[PDB]
Structure formats: C-alpha cells, structure tokens
Write an enzyme that holds these catalytic residues in place. Sequence first.
Site, PDB file in Angstrom:
ATOM      1  CB  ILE A   9      -4.558  95.258  40.764  1.00 36.39           C
ATOM      2  CG1 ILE A   9      -5.145  94.369  41.855  1.00 36.39           C
ATOM      3  CG2 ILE A   9      -4.070  96.578  41.346  1.00 36.39           C
ATOM      4  CD1 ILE A   9      -4.101  93.735  42.738  1.00 36.39           C
ATOM      5  CB  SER A  13     -12.033  82.469  41.609  1.00 34.73           C
ATOM      6  OG  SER A  13     -10.998  81.601  41.183  1.00 34.73           O
ATOM      7  CG  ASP A  16     -13.971  93.165  39.613  1.00 34.42           C
ATOM      8  OD1 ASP A  16     -13.538  92.330  38.780  1.00 34.42           O
ATOM      9  OD2 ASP A  16     -15.022  93.816  39.447  1.00 34.42           O
ATOM     10  CB  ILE A  17      -8.077  91.872  42.923  1.00 37.44           C
ATOM     11  CG1 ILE A  17      -8.558  90.422  42.701  1.00 37.44           C
ATOM     12  CG2 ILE A  17      -7.088  91.984  44.061  1.00 37.44           C
ATOM     13  CD1 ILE A  17      -9.290  89.826  43.875  1.00 37.44           C
ATOM     14  CG  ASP A 121      -7.593  78.378  38.655  1.00 35.57           C
ATOM     15  OD1 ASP A 121      -7.006  77.812  37.697  1.00 35.57           O
ATOM     16  OD2 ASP A 121      -8.040  79.539  38.598  1.00 35.57           O
TER      17      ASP A 121
HETATM   18  C1  LIG Z   1       3.485  98.311  46.416  1.00 34.08           C
HETATM   19  O1  LIG Z   1       3.567  98.626  45.045  1.00 34.08           O
HETATM   20  C2  LIG Z   1       2.798  97.874  44.136  1.00 34.08           C
HETATM   21  C3  LIG Z   1       2.988  98.113  42.787  1.00 34.08           C
HETATM   22  C4  LIG Z   1       2.256  97.413  41.840  1.00 34.08           C
HETATM   23  C5  LIG Z   1       1.335  96.453  42.241  1.00 34.08           C
HETATM   24  O2  LIG Z   1       0.593  95.727  41.293  1.00 34.08           O
HETATM   25  C6  LIG Z   1       0.174  96.446  40.163  1.00 34.08           C
HETATM   26  C7  LIG Z   1       1.147  96.192  43.586  1.00 34.08           C
HETATM   27  C8  LIG Z   1       0.114  95.135  44.007  1.00 34.08           C
HETATM   28  C9  LIG Z   1       0.658  93.730  44.234  1.00 34.08           C
HETATM   29  C10 LIG Z   1      -0.467  92.714  44.521  1.00 34.08           C
HETATM   30  O3  LIG Z   1      -1.138  92.278  43.644  1.00 34.08           O
HETATM   31  N1  LIG Z   1      -0.677  92.324  45.900  1.00 34.08           N
HETATM   32  C11 LIG Z   1      -1.675  91.402  46.372  1.00 34.08           C
HETATM   33  C12 LIG Z   1      -2.592  90.816  45.518  1.00 34.08           C
HETATM   34  C13 LIG Z   1      -3.526  89.956  46.051  1.00 34.08           C
HETATM   35  C14 LIG Z   1      -4.504  89.276  45.110  1.00 34.08           C
HETATM   36  S1  LIG Z   1      -4.094  88.948  43.578  1.00 34.08           S
HETATM   37  C15 LIG Z   1      -5.476  88.217  43.125  1.00 34.08           C
HETATM   38  N2  LIG Z   1      -5.740  87.685  41.797  1.00 34.08           N
HETATM   39  N3  LIG Z   1      -4.929  87.775  40.894  1.00 34.08           N
HETATM   40  C16 LIG Z   1      -5.247  87.207  39.591  1.00 34.08           C
HETATM   41  C17 LIG Z   1      -4.361  87.313  38.527  1.00 34.08           C
HETATM   42  C18 LIG Z   1      -4.679  86.744  37.296  1.00 34.08           C
HETATM   43  C19 LIG Z   1      -5.872  86.065  37.126  1.00 34.08           C
HETATM   44  C20 LIG Z   1      -6.754  85.957  38.185  1.00 34.08           C
HETATM   45  C21 LIG Z   1      -6.441  86.523  39.411  1.00 34.08           C
HETATM   46  N4  LIG Z   1      -6.372  88.177  44.198  1.00 34.08           N
HETATM   47  C22 LIG Z   1      -5.807  88.783  45.413  1.00 34.08           C
HETATM   48  C23 LIG Z   1      -6.615  88.901  46.699  1.00 34.08           C
HETATM   49  C24 LIG Z   1      -7.298  87.833  47.232  1.00 34.08           C
HETATM   50  C25 LIG Z   1      -8.050  87.993  48.375  1.00 34.08           C
HETATM   51  C26 LIG Z   1      -8.167  89.241  48.965  1.00 34.08           C
HETATM   52  F1  LIG Z   1      -8.908  89.418  50.093  1.00 34.08           F
HETATM   53  C27 LIG Z   1      -7.504  90.318  48.420  1.00 34.08           C
HETATM   54  C28 LIG Z   1      -6.742  90.155  47.278  1.00 34.08           C
HETATM   55  C29 LIG Z   1      -3.510  89.694  47.410  1.00 34.08           C
HETATM   56  C30 LIG Z   1      -2.568  90.317  48.198  1.00 34.08           C
HETATM   57  N5  LIG Z   1      -1.686  91.141  47.660  1.00 34.08           N
HETATM   58  C31 LIG Z   1       1.872  96.909  44.537  1.00 34.08           C
END
Ligand SMILES: COc1ccc(OC)c(CCC(=O)Nc2cc(-c3sc(/N=N/c4ccccc4)nc3-c3ccc(F)cc3)ccn2)c1
Length: 287
Positions: A9, A13, A16-17, A121
Amino acid sequence: NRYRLGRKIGSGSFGDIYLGTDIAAEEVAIKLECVKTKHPQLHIESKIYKMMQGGVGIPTIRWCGAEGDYNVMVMELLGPSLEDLFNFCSRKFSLKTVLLLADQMISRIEYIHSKNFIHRDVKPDNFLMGLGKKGNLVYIIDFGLAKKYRDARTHQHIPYRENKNLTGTARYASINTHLGIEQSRRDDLESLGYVLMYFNLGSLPWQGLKAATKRQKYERISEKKMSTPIEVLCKGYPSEFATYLNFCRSLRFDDKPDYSYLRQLFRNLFHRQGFSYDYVFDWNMLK
Ligand SMILES: COc1ccc(OC)c(CCC(=O)Nc2cc(-c3sc(/N=N/c4ccccc4)nc3-c3ccc(F)cc3)ccn2)c1
C-alpha cells in the site's frame, strides 16, 4: 500470531507498508525492512512505539521480529490517513473539521514530546483515523525519523547545531529546518501549522516550484517560505492560523511549547463559530 502478507500500500520512512491478515483472527498492517540493510532501523522504531504505548492515538504493535529476508513489524489496522480523507472530501475541509483535527494533532505531538522524542516528519500521511470504536480518534504514525531531544534522566536538551541536511518532507518543513538548524519541539508544531493551512487552501504556495537539482529544489521552497509573510500565507482565513504559526516560529530552540495555548486558540475560535464538538468530521457526512 502467524501472518499472511497482502498488497503493498505504500512506503514509510524506511520500509514498505503492506496490508496483511492474521489468518487466525484479524486484518493487520505490516512494515518490512531488508534484514541485510546497511542502516537497520525497524527494531529501533519498534522500541520507540513500545515507549509510546498506551498513549491516546498511539498505535499498538502486535509483533516484531525477523522472517526470511526481512525484519517485520505488525501493527493494528488503522483507518485512512488524513491525506486519503482529504482526497475523499474533494480536497476541501470545513473549518470545523480543521479545528477538530488541530486539537487532536497538537495533543499527539505533545504526547510524543512528553516521552522525550520529536517526530520530525509531521504531515497528513502520518496521521490516520482509527476504526470502529476509535473512529473519532486521530492516530500519529511513523517514528523512523524520530529523535530523542532530551535526556531521559536529566531532561538536558540536545545542543544547537547548524548546516544540517533537510530531514523530512520539504513541503511541511520548518523555516529553521530549511536553514539547516537542528530540529526541536518547535519544529514539529510549525510543520503542523503548515499542514493546517494546507487543509484550508488545498495546496501551499511553495508547491510546484521549478529547479534543476534536489538541492536547489529545497532551496526554492525555503526561499518561498521565508519571503511569504504569515499574513499573506493566511490571508482570508481566521487570524488564529497566523497566530499559531507566529508563535511556533518565535519559540527558542530548547523552549517547551505552550501546547495548551495553541489548543486554546483553536478552541476559542471553535466556540465563537458556534460549532458543536460532536466529533462529526466532513467524511462522516459522506453518503
Ligand atoms: C479495510 O479496507 C481497506 C481499504 C483500503 C485500504 O488502503 C488502501 C486499507 C488500508 C488502510 C491503512 O493504510 N491502514 C494502516 C496503515 C498503516 C501505515 S501507513 C504508513 N505510511 N504511510 C505513508 C503514506 C505516504 C507517505 C509515506 C508513508 N505506515 C504504516 C505502518 C507503520 C508501522 C507498521 F508496523 C505497519 C504499518 C498502519 C496501520 N494501518 C484498508
């Protein structure tokens, strides 16, 4: 306890997520880091999340460890980011929604500062709404650029430093960050001020400037921020947004910000506007 990796998705920083599933129970978010990376950081970030645990709007980490070629951090699934919601709301937020968001975002930053870290950030992508019973709660994410600004025992503040490379997102960086100064608490709050004016305007006036290299690129942004007075930046919007930014810009490097004063500015405006503090954001009105 055993996790299936889904679609990518985006990227945080330093990794990848992904969306994933805890096959036994629930849907999760997963951050991956190459285990052979020259600058491992995921476990450092995990320990910061752990130090922050229990705070309002602080996400919960479900599991961190190594699997195969990756270091893995699994997080409770959160809702859309404020940038996502901005787009869903036609890239315009009502004043009521901006003020509701401002109150919580100041509090999230205060909380992180109370645990001895600066975020570095602050941007819409790093604030996510909760889900279910936490749907009215703004969460803050991503400590990959975070830094301790004071000693945990003595609270001695880090020293002033110059000629530093810009850390974070240029669009929202403080003027002093552009000028190479070590970031401190004031800079997190100044960035939030630019985020709020971004929500008001739909774009900031230092977006879309031309240059040749990324070095000059950040220079142009710096020059535009310095040469745009706050009264011009905030023209046509309530004076509180300028007052907020002027306060942040006026803080000394090691000053403890008056977070309550800044929240009170927007709370007083909220009251004068006749708004109800019912946590009904613009996106709650989508049909
Ligand atoms: C249920 O139906 C859905 C339908 C569509 C959906 O979306 C397409 C979703 C998903 C929603 C979602 O995103 N949920 C979410 C995200 C994170 C993030 S977001 C991030 N960075 N974002 C950026 C953005 C821009 C630039 C840079 C970074 N990092 C972490 C993260 C951090 C630590 C970790 F351990 C895991 C994740 C954490 C928890 N929940 C659901």
